[PDB]
Design an enzyme around this catalytic site. Structure first.
Site, short mmCIF file in Angstrom:
data_model
loop_
_atom_site.label_atom_id
_atom_site.label_comp_id
_atom_site.label_asym_id
_atom_site.label_seq_id
_atom_site.Cartn_x
_atom_site.Cartn_y
_atom_site.Cartn_z
N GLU A 1 0.83 -1.20 0.00
CA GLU A 1 0.00 0.00 0.00
C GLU A 1 0.87 1.25 0.00
OE1 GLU A 1 -2.37 0.54 3.60
OE2 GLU A 1 -3.68 1.96 2.55
N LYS B 1 -9.26 2.68 -3.47
CA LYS B 1 -9.84 2.22 -2.22
C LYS B 1 -11.24 2.79 -2.03
CE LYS B 1 -8.44 1.45 2.51
NZ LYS B 1 -7.59 1.88 3.65
N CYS C 1 -5.79 -2.93 2.36
CA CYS C 1 -5.66 -2.77 3.80
C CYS C 1 -6.98 -3.15 4.49
CB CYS C 1 -5.18 -1.35 4.09
SG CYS C 1 -5.05 -0.92 5.81
C1 LIG Z 1 -19.43 9.95 22.82
C2 LIG Z 1 -18.99 9.31 21.50
C3 LIG Z 1 -17.81 8.31 21.64
C4 LIG Z 1 -17.60 7.46 20.36
C5 LIG Z 1 -16.27 6.66 20.27
C6 LIG Z 1 -15.02 7.51 19.93
C7 LIG Z 1 -13.94 6.84 19.03
C8 LIG Z 1 -12.47 7.15 19.37
C9 LIG Z 1 -11.39 6.65 18.76
C10 LIG Z 1 -10.31 7.45 18.03
C11 LIG Z 1 -8.81 7.05 18.07
C12 LIG Z 1 -8.43 5.85 17.14
C13 LIG Z 1 -7.33 6.13 16.08
C14 LIG Z 1 -6.97 4.97 15.10
C15 LIG Z 1 -5.91 5.37 14.04
C16 LIG Z 1 -5.92 4.57 12.70
C17 LIG Z 1 -4.60 4.79 11.94
O1 LIG Z 1 -3.52 4.67 12.43
O2 LIG Z 1 -4.71 5.12 10.61
C18 LIG Z 1 -4.18 4.17 9.69
C19 LIG Z 1 -4.38 4.61 8.20
O3 LIG Z 1 -3.40 5.58 7.97
C20 LIG Z 1 -4.13 3.40 7.23
O4 LIG Z 1 -4.39 3.88 5.94
C1 LIG Z 2 -14.93 13.12 16.88
C2 LIG Z 2 -15.76 12.21 15.97
C3 LIG Z 2 -16.63 11.18 16.75
C4 LIG Z 2 -17.21 10.05 15.85
C5 LIG Z 2 -17.94 8.88 16.60
C6 LIG Z 2 -17.12 7.55 16.75
C7 LIG Z 2 -17.22 6.54 15.57
C8 LIG Z 2 -16.70 5.10 15.79
C9 LIG Z 2 -16.63 4.11 14.88
C10 LIG Z 2 -15.34 3.44 14.39
C11 LIG Z 2 -13.96 3.80 15.04
C12 LIG Z 2 -12.91 2.63 15.12
C13 LIG Z 2 -11.80 2.65 14.03
C14 LIG Z 2 -10.38 2.17 14.44
C15 LIG Z 2 -9.41 2.13 13.23
C16 LIG Z 2 -8.18 1.19 13.35
C17 LIG Z 2 -8.09 0.24 12.14
O1 LIG Z 2 -8.96 -0.54 11.86
O2 LIG Z 2 -6.96 0.30 11.37
C18 LIG Z 2 -6.33 -0.95 11.10
C19 LIG Z 2 -5.68 -0.98 9.67
O3 LIG Z 2 -6.70 -1.38 8.82
C20 LIG Z 2 -5.25 0.47 9.26
O4 LIG Z 2 -4.39 0.32 8.17
#
Ligand SMILES: CCCCCCC/C=C/CCCCCCCC(=O)OC[C@@H](O)CO
Ligand SMILES: CCCCCCC/C=C/CCCCCCCC(=O)OC[C@@H](O)CO
Ligand SMILES: CCCCCCC/C=C/CCCCCCCC(=O)OC[C@@H](O)CO
Ligand SMILES: CCCCCCC/C=C/CCCCCCCC(=O)OC[C@@H](O)CO
Ligand SMILES: CCCCCCC/C=C/CCCCCCCC(=O)OC[C@@H](O)CO
Ligand SMILES: CCCCCCC/C=C\CCCCCCCC(=O)OC[C@@H](O)CO
Length: 505
Positions: free
Chosen positions: A264, A332, A384
């Site tokens: 990727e 994608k 991915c």
């Molecule tokens: C009250 C409402 C509460 C709702 C829940 C809040 C959710 C919080 C989580 C947010 C933090 C998670 C960050 C994951 C990073 C993914 C990454 O590294 O990116 C890869 C990409 O670059 C590949 O292409």
């Molecule tokens: C402020 C805004 C609040 C919005 C409400 C929260 C929404 C939550 C739902 C989904 C969040 C979970 C996603 C985690 C991603 C990590 C992943 O899977 O990355 C792996 C690989 O695939 C990357 O390359």
């Protein structure tokens, strides 16, 4: 007396639920203890017995919190390395994400005991699987979804793997909740009959593992190479050193490997800006009979004279002459929540200062796109995170597909269990569609998966290496490839309809 008050006994159930939830993480790679799935689900169904709905919902929440809190906290690795926030905020965000997904297990528990309060086999064997199927769908759909940690995937090397090519992995999720429900019922009621039924239902699928829904195509065997550049994390100087690594690893393979694959976004530059490199490489590949498939970012100017920025796969060489206007390419479709977009960002955008908005936004390719074609080989592509979306991969699959293709970069999560869980789900696609799957990654896990989910070749993580092996295509349609999800959704409606009507009686 205090240890035996009603609220203390409820709290004991909340702690036990947290534990049983965490045990389920042991079912997935790299632990691969598939019995832990049955243990984790037995507690969920046992601890919710004889509870009022809001109590049961709290038990389902803590169960999910143990499962997601222990099985998804690897996301911390990416947040802490690139997020730029203090440690406590990073912990809190991980806790927040786990609490969000635990809402769906809570919803499952609350609804299950509200409509089926009594400890029945109907509840555990009919209503629970049907309802589990619904709440898990919502977890993987709401806000684009996150269908991570589905116990079915823990059966890739287990007794129930033979069901996946027939009704897909969700059918395994379905049976596991039924089998675990009946085992829980047998223990609290101390009765042998639900145990026997659970054992029969669990063992009946065992012979299916031996079905080969496919035929190998030996006359189309080729040598494929997958370059694992192991590139760390706006500097042309470093882009040139990245093309150097990939070109120099690829040049000795032209004329020998019919198919070469970079992961990727291997080319960490705009396609528009690399026409001379890509055309030269095209010619060298064509003059030696080899093809190259590679990830790249493509900022394409559109009808409206704006740039749609895609996460893209391009093809070059024999049977795929490179061209910026070629349709032999893949964009994608499903962006990573919080990685490539923020959920709800379109709604709340008009109120954001322009200077604070990201420089570029990622656009989405169509849900269905044709197979890539390289050196006469048909490749059904997923980038991915997309490989975990079984129904989507199956809708892009065509009978003439020769290999499934996935390229990804999981370096964001370093040495954690994330990349292994991801790799685990990728294998389920090869088993579901009975096609070998070529998985090219930046720093692991790079592997060739065979038409029955077996690991056929692999190079270790965190290595600058080329995986070179011979791979044979397959033809033939699994029952799941022919149908998709709708057989299990019918069964889920039969089960759901019959359970709720009796709960009304
Ligand atoms: C009250 C409402 C509460 C709702 C829940 C809040 C959710 C919080 C989580 C947010 C933090 C998670 C960050 C994951 C990073 C993914 C990454 O590294 O990116 C890869 C990409 O670059 C590949 O292409
Ligand atoms: C402020 C805004 C609040 C919005 C409400 C929260 C929404 C939550 C739902 C989904 C969040 C979970 C996603 C985690 C991603 C990590 C992943 O899977 O990355 C792996 C690989 O695939 C990357 O390359
Ligand atoms: C026997 C009694 C013991 C008491 C409880 C046992 C059950 C455990 C499950 C609890 C899961 C908690 C979720 C918090 C998020 C973790 C985090 O902050 O992220 C870590 C990341 O930084 C590492 O990569
Ligand atoms: C767009 C977002 C929609 C997401 C779908 C889910 C809808 C939620 C409703 C139903 C299930 C969640 C409520 C029960 C869990 C909370 C609780 O009782 O906590 C107790 C625990 O904290 C004890 O410590
Ligand atoms: C090419 C086509 C191949 C097709 C193979 C697919 C097989 C899938 C079906 C498996 C699902 C059956 C579930 C029956 C539930 C019995 C029960 O609830 O028992 C209650 C009792 O225990 C209380 O005491
Ligand atoms: C009433 C009968 C007695 C009740 C006993 C409960 C038995 C079941 C649960 C087992 C408890 C272990 C939970 C953590 C497993 C390690 C893990 O998940 O590692 C993830 C790590 O990698 C974080 O990233």
């Amino acid at each position: 007396m205090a240890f035996a008050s009603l609220i203390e006994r409820q709290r004991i159930r909340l702690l036990l639920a947290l534990l049983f939830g965490a045990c389920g993480t042991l079912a997935f790679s790299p632990y691969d203890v598939w019995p832990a799935a049955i243990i984790s689900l037995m507690g969920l169904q046992a601890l919710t017995f004889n509870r009022r709905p809001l109590q049961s919902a709290a038990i389902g929440f803590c169960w999910g919190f143990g499962l997601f809190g222990s099985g998804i906290n690897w996301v911390y690795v990416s947040i802490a390395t690139f997020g730029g926030m203090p440690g406590p905020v990073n912990i809190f965000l991980v806790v927040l994400l786990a609490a969000y997904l635990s809402l769906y297990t809570g919803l499952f528990a609350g609804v299950l005991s509200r409509l089926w309060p009594k400890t029945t086999w109907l509840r555990v064997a009919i209503a629970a699987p049907a309802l589990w199927q619904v709440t898990e769908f919502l977890r993987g759909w709401v806000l684009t979804g996150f269908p991570w940690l589905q116990f079915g995937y823990s059966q890739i090397d287990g007794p129930l793997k033979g069901l996946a090519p027939i009704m897909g992995v969700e059918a395994i999720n379905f049976l596991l909740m039924m089998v675990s429900g009946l085992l829980a019922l047998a223990l609290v009621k101390r009765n042998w009959r639900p145990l026997v039924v659970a054992v029969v239902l669990f063992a009946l699928p065992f012979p299916l593992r031996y079905i080969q829904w496919f035929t190998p195509q030996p006359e189309k065997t080729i040598q494929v190479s997958m370059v694992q550049g192991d590139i760390p994390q706006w500097d042309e100087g470093q882009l040139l050193n990245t093309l150097k690594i990939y070109y120099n690893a690829t040049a000795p393979l032209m004329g020998k490997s019919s198919l070469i694959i970079w992961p990727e976004s291997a080319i960490t530059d705009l396609e528009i800006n690399q026409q001379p490199f890509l055309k030269a490489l095209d010619g060298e590949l064509r003059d030696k009979g080899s093809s190259l498939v590679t990830g790249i970012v493509d900022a394409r100017l559109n009808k409206q004279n704006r740039y749609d920025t895609y996460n893209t796969i391009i093809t070059l060489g024999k049977g795929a002459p490179y061209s910026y206007e070629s349709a032999d390419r893949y964009n994608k479709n499903h962006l990573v929540p919080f990685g490539e977009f923020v959920p709800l960002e379109s709604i709340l955008r008009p109120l954001a200062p322009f200077f604070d908005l990201p420089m570029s936004s990622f656009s989405r390719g169509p849900y269905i796109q044709p197979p890539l074609s390289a050196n006469g080989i048909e490749l059904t592509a997923a980038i991915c995170y997309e490989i975990i979306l079984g129904e989507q991969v199956r809708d892009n699959f065509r009978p003439d597909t020769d290999y499934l293709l996935t390229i990804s970069n999981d370096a964001w999560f370093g040495k954690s269990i994330g990349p292994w869980q991801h790799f685990q789900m990728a294998r389920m696609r090869a088993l579901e569609l009975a096609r070998p799957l070529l998985r090219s990654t930046n720093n692991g896990i790079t592997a060739v998966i065979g038409p029955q989910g077996e690991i056929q070749a692999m190079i270790p993580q965190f290595t600058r290496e080329v995986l070179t092996t011979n791979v044979t295509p397959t033809t033939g349609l699994t029952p799941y490839a022919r149908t998709g999800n709708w057989p299990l959704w019918v069964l889920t409606a039969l089960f759901g309809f019959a359970a709720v009507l009796m709960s009304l009686r």
